[PDB]
């Protein structure tokens, strides 16, 4: 299976100045649950924004840099390389990789953050005419989770 895994706000913002614009531990738990024991594929900039691979899953970084080498990270140099990765593969970020992959993936796990944040990085536009809502689950508002958010699982029609 090839899936997108993303959190975006009401205007599809996913990032600002190398950071997630919001703080939502519940969504990090969601990521951990979905992707543990599987594979994350991310662009070079997304990886460097996090700085270290996420534990207990395969971390794959897409870059043109032939010297790129990080402990606990597997490197690929082409989009075509993604299709050779075994198991459940999650396209993890960023804007560039999402733009290259949105027309290719089987499904998308999207956390819709019900706010409007300042951003410099965006998920590509998409229409529900193309995507069936397999599930839609409201996140719980919390001491440490104070922004409304909805977990969507979308499957290509």
Ligand X SMILES: COc1cc([C@H](C)C#Cc2c(C)nc(N)nc2N)ccc1-c1ccccc1
CB 104 within 8 A of CB 144: no
Does the protein bind ligand X through residue 111 (CB under 6 A)? yes
Does the protein bind ligand X through residue 20 (CB under 6 A)? yes
Q: Contacts with ligand NDP in 37-96 (CB under 6 A)?
A: 42-46, 49, 62-65, 77-79, 93-96
C-alpha–C-alpha distance, residues 59 and 90, integer Å:
10
Does the protein bind ligand NDP through residue 26 (CB under 6 A)? no
CB 101 within 8 A of CB 4: yes
> 6 pairs with which residues across the strands?
110
Q: Which of 9, 89, 92, 154 binds ligand X (CB under 6 A)?
A: 92
Identify what 18 binds: ligand X, ligand NDP, none; CB under 5 to 8 Å per kind.
Answer: ligand NDP
Q: Which of 12, 13, 21, 27 binds ligand X (CB under 6 A)?
A: 27
Nearest one of 32, 82, 77 to 54, comparing CA atoms: 32
Identify what 5 binds: ligand NDP, ligand X, none; CB under 5 to 8 Å per kind.
Answer: ligand X
End-to-end CA distance of the chain: 15
Based on CB atoms, which residue is closest to ligand NDP, 26 or 49? 49
CB atoms near residue 105 (< 10 Å)? 20
Give me the phi and psi of 18, to 5 degrees please. Answer: 70, 15
Q: Contact positions toward ligand X, by CB under 6 A?
A: 5-7, 20, 27-28, 30-31, 46, 49-50, 54, 92-93, 111
């Amino acid at each position: 299976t090839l899936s997108i895994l993303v959190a975006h706000d009401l205007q599809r913002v996913i990032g600002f100045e190398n950071q997630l614009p919001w703080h939502l531990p519940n969504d990090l738990k969601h990521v951990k649950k979905l992707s543990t024991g599987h594979t994350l594929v991310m662009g070079r900039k997304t990886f460097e924004s996090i700085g270290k691979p996420l534990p207990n899953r395969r971390n794959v970084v897409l870059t043109s840099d032939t010297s790129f080498n990080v402990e606990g990270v597997d490197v690929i140099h082409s989009i075509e390389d993604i299709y050779q990765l075994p198991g459940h593969v999650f396209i993890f970020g960023g804007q560039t990789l999402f733009e290259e992959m949105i027309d290719k993936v089987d499904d998308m796990y999207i956390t819709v953050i019900e706010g409007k944040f300042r951003g410099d990085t965006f998920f590509p536009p998409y229409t529900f005419e193309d995507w069936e809502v397999a599930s839609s689950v409201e996140g719980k508002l919390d001491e440490k989770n104070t922004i409304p958010h909805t977990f969507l699982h979308l499957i290509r029609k």
